[PDB]
Design an enzyme around this catalytic site. Structure first.
Site, mmCIF file in Angstrom:
data_model
loop_
_atom_site.group_PDB
_atom_site.id
_atom_site.type_symbol
_atom_site.label_atom_id
_atom_site.label_comp_id
_atom_site.label_asym_id
_atom_site.label_seq_id
_atom_site.Cartn_x
_atom_site.Cartn_y
_atom_site.Cartn_z
ATOM 1 N N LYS A 45 -32.616 -1.019 19.216
ATOM 2 C CA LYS A 45 -33.241 -2.324 19.151
ATOM 3 C C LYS A 45 -33.488 -2.752 17.712
ATOM 4 O O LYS A 45 -33.422 -1.922 16.799
ATOM 5 C CB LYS A 45 -34.547 -2.285 19.936
ATOM 6 C CG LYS A 45 -34.368 -2.057 21.430
ATOM 7 C CD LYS A 45 -35.626 -2.408 22.175
ATOM 8 C CE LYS A 45 -35.531 -1.932 23.580
ATOM 9 N NZ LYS A 45 -36.820 -2.128 24.240
ATOM 10 N N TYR A 74 -32.028 -9.486 30.245
ATOM 11 C CA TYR A 74 -33.437 -9.306 30.562
ATOM 12 C C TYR A 74 -33.878 -10.300 31.621
ATOM 13 O O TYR A 74 -35.058 -10.616 31.719
ATOM 14 C CB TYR A 74 -34.286 -9.469 29.295
ATOM 15 C CG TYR A 74 -34.372 -8.248 28.389
ATOM 16 C CD1 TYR A 74 -34.822 -7.023 28.879
ATOM 17 C CD2 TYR A 74 -34.037 -8.332 27.021
ATOM 18 C CE1 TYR A 74 -34.916 -5.908 28.049
ATOM 19 C CE2 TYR A 74 -34.128 -7.215 26.173
ATOM 20 C CZ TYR A 74 -34.574 -6.011 26.694
ATOM 21 O OH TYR A 74 -34.670 -4.900 25.887
ATOM 22 N N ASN A 132 -40.097 -0.504 20.758
ATOM 23 C CA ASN A 132 -39.956 0.873 21.149
ATOM 24 C C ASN A 132 -38.560 1.434 20.947
ATOM 25 O O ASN A 132 -38.091 2.259 21.732
ATOM 26 C CB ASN A 132 -40.471 1.078 22.577
ATOM 27 C CG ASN A 132 -39.606 0.411 23.601
ATOM 28 O OD1 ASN A 132 -38.730 -0.349 23.254
ATOM 29 N ND2 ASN A 132 -39.834 0.701 24.873
ATOM 30 N N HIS A 191 -33.065 1.138 23.999
ATOM 31 C CA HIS A 191 -32.905 0.830 25.415
ATOM 32 C C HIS A 191 -31.888 1.764 26.036
ATOM 33 O O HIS A 191 -30.857 2.032 25.439
ATOM 34 C CB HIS A 191 -32.414 -0.616 25.656
ATOM 35 C CG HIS A 191 -31.935 -0.854 27.068
ATOM 36 N ND1 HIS A 191 -32.784 -1.202 28.103
ATOM 37 C CD2 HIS A 191 -30.710 -0.703 27.631
ATOM 38 C CE1 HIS A 191 -32.095 -1.287 29.227
ATOM 39 N NE2 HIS A 191 -30.839 -0.979 28.971
ATOM 40 N N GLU A 237 -24.911 -3.433 32.809
ATOM 41 C CA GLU A 237 -25.123 -3.624 31.383
ATOM 42 C C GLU A 237 -23.856 -3.335 30.558
ATOM 43 O O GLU A 237 -23.564 -4.051 29.593
ATOM 44 C CB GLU A 237 -26.307 -2.778 30.895
ATOM 45 C CG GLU A 237 -27.640 -3.267 31.415
ATOM 46 C CD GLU A 237 -28.756 -2.244 31.309
ATOM 47 O OE1 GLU A 237 -28.514 -1.149 30.780
ATOM 48 O OE2 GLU A 237 -29.883 -2.543 31.764
HETATM 49 N N1 LIG Z 1 -45.940 -5.285 27.782
HETATM 50 C C1 LIG Z 1 -44.803 -5.500 27.083
HETATM 51 N N2 LIG Z 1 -44.792 -6.304 25.984
HETATM 52 C C2 LIG Z 1 -43.669 -6.529 25.272
HETATM 53 N N3 LIG Z 1 -42.483 -5.980 25.603
HETATM 54 C C3 LIG Z 1 -42.349 -5.150 26.685
HETATM 55 C C4 LIG Z 1 -43.534 -4.853 27.510
HETATM 56 N N4 LIG Z 1 -43.136 -4.025 28.497
HETATM 57 C C5 LIG Z 1 -41.809 -3.804 28.317
HETATM 58 N N5 LIG Z 1 -41.334 -4.475 27.244
HETATM 59 C C6 LIG Z 1 -39.933 -4.469 26.727
HETATM 60 O O1 LIG Z 1 -39.001 -4.078 27.740
HETATM 61 C C7 LIG Z 1 -38.307 -2.898 27.325
HETATM 62 C C8 LIG Z 1 -38.001 -1.958 28.471
HETATM 63 O O2 LIG Z 1 -39.098 -1.869 29.365
HETATM 64 P P1 LIG Z 1 -39.071 -2.803 30.667
HETATM 65 O O3 LIG Z 1 -38.041 -3.890 30.447
HETATM 66 O O4 LIG Z 1 -40.504 -3.168 30.993
HETATM 67 O O5 LIG Z 1 -38.509 -1.809 31.813
HETATM 68 P P2 LIG Z 1 -36.977 -1.293 31.922
HETATM 69 O O6 LIG Z 1 -36.938 -0.184 30.891
HETATM 70 O O7 LIG Z 1 -36.853 -0.832 33.360
HETATM 71 O O8 LIG Z 1 -36.112 -2.492 31.614
HETATM 72 C C9 LIG Z 1 -39.241 -2.230 26.346
HETATM 73 O O9 LIG Z 1 -38.507 -1.346 25.503
HETATM 74 C C10 LIG Z 1 -39.847 -3.416 25.624
HETATM 75 O O10 LIG Z 1 -39.010 -3.863 24.543
HETATM 76 O O1 VO4 Z 2 -34.883 -1.907 26.546
HETATM 77 V V1 VO4 Z 2 -35.137 -0.702 28.017
HETATM 78 O O2 VO4 Z 2 -35.052 -1.798 29.584
HETATM 79 O O3 VO4 Z 2 -33.878 0.717 28.214
HETATM 80 O O4 VO4 Z 2 -36.816 0.220 27.855
#
Ligand SMILES: Nc1ncnc2c1ncn2[C@@H]1O[C@H](COP(=O)(O)OP(=O)(O)O)[C@@H](O)[C@H]1O
Ligand code: VO4
Length: 149
Positions: free
Chosen positions: A9, A49, A112, A115, A126
């Site tokens: 990311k 997303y 974080n 992905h 994806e």
């Molecule tokens: N509370 C939040 N605020 C901002 N970004 C978020 C939050 N929760 C998840 N994300 C974004 O979504 C990414 C992946 O988590 P999420 O999309 O919630 O589940 P998944 O990993 O199943 O797609 C995270 O790495 C982060 O970038």
């Molecule tokens: O950007 V993630 O949906 O692999 O946490």
């Protein structure tokens, strides 16, 4: 062999952690099979997303993923989807195990580092979205005989 979609990311990119993150994937025995540094266009951000369209963080997520280049990857290995998610760690970096990529490198859930696809189904989804077959290579590696029986 099972394939998954990984994405370094823009936080990791802007913190100059590309090599560090790639290393952790390689040393785990996963095979880099496709990889490109690319700016993420809005449409691609929003379709990737799309499952979050209503959420509080959605607008902030699109903003973030488009704010600088990413390193999109296709990674190949036995159980690759779960293996990758295992070394990546929990979504929130403070719940991610020390030693995982998010455990070691990430501070907040929104920023974080990496992905990975969360299932076999979203993997294939994806991968098709980010990559054409002609951008995904296919090769035998010397260590293949030593990762598998
Ligand atoms: N509370 C939040 N605020 C901002 N970004 C978020 C939050 N929760 C998840 N994300 C974004 O979504 C990414 C992946 O988590 P999420 O999309 O919630 O589940 P998944 O990993 O199943 O797609 C995270 O790495 C982060 O970038
Ligand atoms: O950007 V993630 O949906 O692999 O946490």
């Amino acid at each position: 062999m099972e394939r998954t979609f990984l994405m370094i990311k823009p936080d990791a990119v802007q913190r100059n952690l590309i090599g560090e993150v790639i290393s952790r994937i390689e040393r785990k025995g996963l095979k880099l099979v496709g990889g490109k540094l690319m700016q993420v266009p809005m449409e691609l951000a929003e379709t990737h997303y799309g499952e979050h369209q209503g959420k509080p963080f959605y607008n902030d997520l699109i903003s973030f993923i488009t704010s600088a280049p990413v390193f999109a990857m296709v990674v190949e290995g036995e159980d690759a989807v779960n293996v990758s998610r295992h070394i990546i760690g929990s979504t929130n970096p403070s719940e991610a195990s020390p030693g995982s990529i998010r455990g070691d490198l990430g501070l907040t859930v929104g920023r974080n580092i990496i992905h990975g696809s969360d299932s076999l189904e979203s993997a294939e989804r994806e991968i098709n979205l980010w990559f054409n077959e002609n951008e995904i290579t296919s090769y035998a590696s010397p260590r293949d005989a030593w990762l598998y029986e």
